[PDB]
């Protein structure tokens, strides 16, 4: 089985694709995005290590095709290594993605 | 020799979607990113302050029309103030920009 998944990702892509709207002001742009940004990583001690893996991650799949989006869409993803794994056996192989 | 080497967040706005293009392998993906990302934020006694303002910007740019990054740099980014500045002028300027 598989359902739900409490973790930072929605608010991430949310504020990531805010697009001028929510705030109708200038400084209000980064204002709202700022609140999300903080809620994106919201590091309480995690150095630039976690952050690095933050942007690195989002981009990790961003670079990948819709393959990862297909596995995630139908639910399957769980580990970054796993994701890249599928993309590997994908752009590398050509068979049932396991 | 007093160089300048202008580079606010080019490698950043460039890394954004490095593109899989199979960098020899899967993990290789992060390799490239982790590199850009790493240099994107880069540690330097900069707590979540820089990290935050980091995503805040990248977003403030992704939300704003390149026209901003142009009206500021004319082909890149410079200062979030200058960006939101030009935007403010478009919303309801009042006095010529700096």
Residues of B contacting chain A (CB within 8 angstroms): 15-22, 25-27, 29-30, 33-34, 37-38, 40-43, 46-48, 51-60, 62-65, 80, 84-85, 87-88, 91
Q: Are B33 and A63 in contact (CB under 8 A)?
A: yes
CB contact under 8 A, B59 and A85: no
Q: Say how many C-beta atoms besides its own lie within 10 A of residue A4's C-beta.
A: 5
Q: Angle B54-B56-B58 (CA atoms, 0-180°, nearest 5)?
A: 70
What is the token pair recorded at A84?
Answer: 């890249």
Q: Record the tokens describing residue A92, joined without a space.
A: 């590398």
Å between A97 CA and nearest CA of chain B? 15
Question: What does the buried/exposed string (b/e) look like for B22-32 if buried means 16 or more CB atoms within 10 Å of the residue's CB?
Answer: ebeebeebbeb
Cα–Cα distances in angstroms (integers) from residue B66 to residues A36, A55, A80, B73, B84, in the given order = 22, 21, 31, 10, 12
> In chain A, what residues touch B51 (CB-CB under 8 Å)?
41, 43, 48, 51
In chain A, which residues have their Cβ closer than 8 Å to the Cβ of B21? Answer: 63
Tell me which of A24, A26, A43 to substitute to probe the interface with B (most B C-beta atoms closer than 10 Å). Answer: A26
DSSP chain A: ------STTHHHHHHHT--S-S--SSHHHHHHHHHHHHHHH--SS--HHHHHHHHHHHHHHHHS-THHHHHHHTS----HHHHHHHHHHHHT--S---
Whole-angstrom distance, CA of residue A30 vs CA of residue B93: 19
Domains and CATH numbers, chain A: 1-98 (1.10.4020.10)
Q: Which residue of A has its CA nearest to B33?
A: A56
Q: Which H/E stretch holds residue B42?
A: none
Distance from CA of B77 to the nearest CA of A (A): 15
Q: Which two tokens stand for residue B86?
A: 């030009």
């Amino acid at each position: 089985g598989s359902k739900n998944c409490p973790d930072p990702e929605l608010c991430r892509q949310s504020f990531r694709r805010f697009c001028y709207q929510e705030v109708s002001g200038p400084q209000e742009a980064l204002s709202q995005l700022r609140q999300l940004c903080r809620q994106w990583l919201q590091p309480e001690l995690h150095t630039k290590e976690q952050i690095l893996e933050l942007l690195v991650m989002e981009q990790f799949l961003t670079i990948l095709p819709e393959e990862i989006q297909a596995r995630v869409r139908h639910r399957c993803l769980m580990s970054s290594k796993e994701i890249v794994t599928l993309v590997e056996d994908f752009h590398r192989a050509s068979k049932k993605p396991k």
